[PDB]
Amino acid sequence: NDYKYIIHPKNRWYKAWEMFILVWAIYSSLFTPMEFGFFRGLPERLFVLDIVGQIAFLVDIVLQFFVAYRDTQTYRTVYKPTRIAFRYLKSHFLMDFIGCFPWDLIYKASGKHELVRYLLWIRLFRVRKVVEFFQRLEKDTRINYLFTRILKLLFVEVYCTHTAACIFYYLATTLPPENEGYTWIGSLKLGDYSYENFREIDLWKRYTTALYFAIVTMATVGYGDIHAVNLREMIFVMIYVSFDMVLGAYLIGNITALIVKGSNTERFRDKMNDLISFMNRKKLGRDLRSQITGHVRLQYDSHYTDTVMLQDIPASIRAKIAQLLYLPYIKKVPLFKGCSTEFINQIVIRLHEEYFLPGEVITEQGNVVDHLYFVCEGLLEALVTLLGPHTSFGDISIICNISQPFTVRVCELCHLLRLDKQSFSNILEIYFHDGRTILNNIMEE
Amino acid sequence: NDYKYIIHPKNRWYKAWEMFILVWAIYSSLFTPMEFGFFRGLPERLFVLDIVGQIAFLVDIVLQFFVAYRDTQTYRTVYKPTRIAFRYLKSHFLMDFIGCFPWDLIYKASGKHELVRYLLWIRLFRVRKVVEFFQRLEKDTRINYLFTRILKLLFVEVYCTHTAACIFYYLATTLPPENEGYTWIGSLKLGDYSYENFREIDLWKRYTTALYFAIVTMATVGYGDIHAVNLREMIFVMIYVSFDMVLGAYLIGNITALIVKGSNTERFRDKMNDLISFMNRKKLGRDLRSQITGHVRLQYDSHYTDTVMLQDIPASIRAKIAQLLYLPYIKKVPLFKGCSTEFINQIVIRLHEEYFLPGEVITEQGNVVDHLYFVCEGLLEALVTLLGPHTSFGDISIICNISQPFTVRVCELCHLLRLDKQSFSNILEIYFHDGRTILNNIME
Amino acid sequence: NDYKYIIHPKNRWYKAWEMFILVWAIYSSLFTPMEFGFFRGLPERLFVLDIVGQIAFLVDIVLQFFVAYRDTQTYRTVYKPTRIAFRYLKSHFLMDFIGCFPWDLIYKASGKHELVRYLLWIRLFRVRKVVEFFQRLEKDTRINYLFTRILKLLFVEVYCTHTAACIFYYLATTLPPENEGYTWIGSLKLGDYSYENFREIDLWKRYTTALYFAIVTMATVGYGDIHAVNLREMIFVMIYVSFDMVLGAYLIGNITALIVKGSNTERFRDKMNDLISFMNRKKLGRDLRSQITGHVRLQYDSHYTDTVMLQDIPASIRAKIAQLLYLPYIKKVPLFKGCSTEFINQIVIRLHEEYFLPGEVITEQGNVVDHLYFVCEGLLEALVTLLGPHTSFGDISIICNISQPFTVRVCELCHLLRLDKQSFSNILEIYFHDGRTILNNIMEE
Amino acid sequence: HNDYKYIIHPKNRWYKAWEMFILVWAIYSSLFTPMEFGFFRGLPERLFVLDIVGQIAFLVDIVLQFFVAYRDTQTYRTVYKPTRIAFRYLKSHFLMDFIGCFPWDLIYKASGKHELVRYLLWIRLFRVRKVVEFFQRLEKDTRINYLFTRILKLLFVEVYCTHTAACIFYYLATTLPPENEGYTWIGSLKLGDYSYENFREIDLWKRYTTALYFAIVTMATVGYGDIHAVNLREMIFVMIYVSFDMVLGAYLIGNITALIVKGSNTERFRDKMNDLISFMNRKKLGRDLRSQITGHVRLQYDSHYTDTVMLQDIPASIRAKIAQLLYLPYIKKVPLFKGCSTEFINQIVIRLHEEYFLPGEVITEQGNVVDHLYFVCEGLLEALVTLLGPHTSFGDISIICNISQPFTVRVCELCHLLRLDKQSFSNILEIYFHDGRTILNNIME
């Protein structure tokens, strides 16, 4: 569908309108409980700030009419400007068009009725754009999805305790200024400071005092210097600490569910509490068992080469991992100069990757060779000549019946491509002109 | 069906009676601690409410000598009259019959003794009609096990604080009204309000103060504006906060066991997170990386494909899978159709339903054949074919065993159906009748 | 055995004494902090109770030289009465002998020095008895074992607050009685009661006040009506809430571990979760989706066959449990069972435990028959023919090899055993004259 | 690669009394530093030389890091080179370690007493590296427990963050002048009959214990409310602090939970045993056969988990001799494996799996093609004909000529039997048909 206005929502200019209008949706939903609770009609040095705030969201409900709804199941950017304009208009339109009115001028214009000031809470449907941000961030593999299920709750508490702080102050102002000794704040004395005549206290002292109660209540510390006094602040504190009691168990739940999918050090000790067993009873040479612990400290703390995981995708396309990365490592070898792709593919059917810390001897001198080795990383030592990367060893003695003439020792941290020497008999006897290719580069010394 | 004055327990009138004594059992067990704690004899403008409250639970005792039950080990609904009158009468008769007696007129017409009034607590045995609700909601997939052990723990933790509010008020009234200053509420002063002469404060101020000190204690906030000053109140809030320590730990434990025991995203994100952590170890581009992003919706999509299949194997309901959606989807393919009952029930087994994201590469040209696909959903594009439903591909690559002659790429999220090729060569050449029935009709 | 007077530790007279000294070890370890904290040397009225409290532990001293030691390595009853005198004199002898001295008479006969009263805390090692009781309770597998770790944490939690109440009261008594206004209890005023001259407040008011502080501190409520005043009470409350912070996280952890390894209804409702999301996309049934969970509530939540856990035990001894239970149910079955030991041992592995709910039909007349079902108990209906226990059906499907002539309906939830037709092909052909001997009396009676 | 003389090897036993010497200087002067900032404005003269000798212990440690060969994590080399260990130090921890060693109390007292030259004391808290480079060397040490290192670096973080929150909370009371002192948390404090007025001349340890008492009661979320925040700058600190340790207490509960729901192998076995015992105790099987399954499924159970973990771990070129030291003296005393070469037994030892079985269980029967081929390590088995003792072999003629195995296996004492597939053995006798001819002759002789 051509439709040369309809923004596909990966456009880079529809991302200076999703982290622009997300900053506005954080301001406009952190300020709206403060505008409801701590003011009755905004002071007129906040008139431009309340006018231009609702313009940025007003030119955002025209940019929902020209945006590409990628469909719910049949994945398709539905470019049709009568089904994006009718998907929006009955999902969230009049919770974005209602909370865009100048509810502070409607309040003051209509004779200052208090009930027309409760429609500020329709502007809390802009934290939607912060929960359509912790949903487009768990769909991002560079961090854990369950870590974002903790960071979602740690914005939720901290938005519920700012909103609770702003409703708890508001409930003090619903009694007349002469009945303020029967409120939580007009009857407060902290230190030598009396919070009498609290409506003329500085805004940030009143906000910080109301937020102090709500945070030491959310944490369930609850000192009791600030407490409910009324019968209507008791009902709010009862609702709020019942909401927190569930919300604080949910936080502990998510942190525990993160930790039960544990870390690599306790996964190392998971693989090693049993490797104290079996080798105490049926013990090996504890020099080589110390290097076994070394190779477990090398599979852990380092590369998790996923031969433990590549069984998920099928064998011919996990041999395609052995195609688009192994045509580098196998064609780079000077032993296979002049070898066609089929021999390469049948060799990389049966390849393995192992790693070697310095200290081993890999193919021992004076004894039979067991495997093919190609060098990816690190650097080796043959004792006489130093055999580095993209090179062959173990391989000058399986083409004939010879032994390994070098104590091929490992000097840097290596990345051996190890293959069974059974394979370099079957692949070598089925393909004959390939066998003579290896024969003539053997005679190319 | 032998007696006809028994009631089948799923009769749709006796499901609108059980929802009628569930709003009385919620009322009469929330009201009963307020009948005990906050009054000494119920007032005169509450007489007709206390009478007609205990009538609804009195035509529930004559209506349960008539109700058929389904046995616990015999597992058949029992309709025997002189057997239901000995199951009800062994379990729930007297705790239903005692708490019906008019214990406010029995209190008042016996010279107002206080011990005739602790028999109101027999009516808290009516909360069993609320645990019989959250225990029949348990067994409901229709209404999720999204939160049942954890909602019935949030009812029992606002029912035990409504009751503790009423016992905590009642212990204030056991000291005479001249020892009010040695009481949690007679010595209370909140703001400029003094709760003195506290028996003459209106009921909802007393009740809301007592509930404030049950909920602030249950949440373990514990401000300290209201606290126990007495020895009997000290003993009560010791018992209560021990019970709450255990109950709050149990609530936290149930929520974290619901969150630990995760299924759907705990088979999905743990795939691609580790897989991109391995492909950013050794770089694999994006085309095959997106194709393996499609592959984690080939081995995880469609109910984890062939792992949950292998449980309803004693019950012969794989006939329904094997002829009710697979063989319709098979009769939705051209030659693969198989077109004969034996062969189609033979190849109906080894299939895999496969979800591919758009933009993907499905089968390249010059590529060795490896799998066979039945398309029923999605839309595919070949590089020559605008593939909608059931015009599926991979047909002429198997007998003419050469590379697939087309490069198909998908444009909207598709739902392929996979068989292995080595199946449909072996039982291909086994069925020579269907061998001819396959290789006669090639698209002319 | 060979040594005469050595009581074996599993008698019925050293198990009435192990529970007699469990109520002297629950008394004398709950009373020992009350004797330390609340008295400066017991009253004369509490004299004989102390002496008989200590005399019941001298009897338990000498009855450890006469108890047969159950060894820890050799796993036997070491009757050697110098192998049971030793390990006692190396384990528990002295600390159960410096807790039997009369430390309230050898405190008052020494000038009443208050440092010999800290030898009362040697009597607190008699909660060995209470934790030994919770060690021979995990062995009792009749009740759960993580549940027996959350009652070994609600004894340890309400014993560490009884002790912390007595230490907290004790710390108020370490200041002189004229500096009592600088203690937590001498400066206490609850309601209109003043706790001044607190040493003459009677013992249960003082104890209940101290214990109320310790319990609302354990629960982390902390009203702060009673709080620490001194520096020594600050240090104690700091130690105690820090200790009780890891003891309360341990309780939550042990509760979670029990709930995670837990219920069989949420082991049933997640199976049916993706099964109903399965059948809402795979479309097996419209109301037999009830007959799906009519069988996920028949074989599951009840009749819990752990046959996948019988896959864990060996096939040999799984055939042996099939012998020892199945074959008395297998043999009381009609004539088409085989009437010989070889046949029933050759078929007994193949039969699967099945149940069926009433109102269900099994196999309609006029189809190929795939299985044979044999009733152990239960009531079946062939249609007009009532088949109770020992009245197994599935006879006429292979005997006179025509179609089945009945419709087996279920009249009571039964105990069928289902072998497949491959069983009554293999075992019926290798023993063929047994099958024709079965045919020799097919309802000829 | 020890070509560099004066470089200290990083595991030397004398540079390990300088990792446990500067860890007791790093524990002292990371605990003393918030006390030096918080409770003093410039140290007294009494604490002079303790200051000076505190910083010439971390000054010796600066030039003892240019002489220590670090060990790489990409080449895994101890880089013994002064030009290569210096530029690692100078770009990781040098400005956090050099200017944390300046005398920031002579730069305070001698720069005219400007505060803000005293906030540079806070970069001596970058010596808790040495305590988290300790809990990262204790956690790659399975020699020590995981209940001693896993929550124990959270019962350091929760007594380091409440020692430091106790010193900032006191410090904020000193930022108000000593006239506006009853508007602080401590100058307006009155506990008991003691008033903390004129608080700057209270002893250091009363002032420190009061602040730590607040901080620990707040960390535990008791919150008595006898000490609370009265300022607005102390309200903000308490709001930051109780929000920080609401996350940190949930992390402690999560760690203690995930250390319990990963309960070890013993209680996994007890779970196994209670469900196994109960499953045939509610149907009431014989206790003798339940004890038979006990005596068998137990060696079978531990054999199962240890054999699968020894096979799936230990990658190739090191697994081979482990398996050979497991198996070859037990399979070379074998009349079937005689005469063949050594590379064949190198291939054999990997595909071997040991097992454990009972005196009385059977492996295969009369009607049977085997699932495996077996050789003997332990056992007293029988073929029903041949009473096979130790160092024996069975399943051999069913390999080559594909005939059914006529002998039921009767094991008479607890064995150590050797699992090898028929499929893999046929695969490697396809490979070693040079040895396969000896195997055909070995079954035929």
Ligand SMILES: [K+]
């Ligand atoms: K408090």
Ligand SMILES: [K+]
């Ligand atoms: K708390």
Ligand SMILES: [K+]
């Ligand atoms: K609290």
Ligand SMILES: [K+]
């Ligand atoms: K509190």
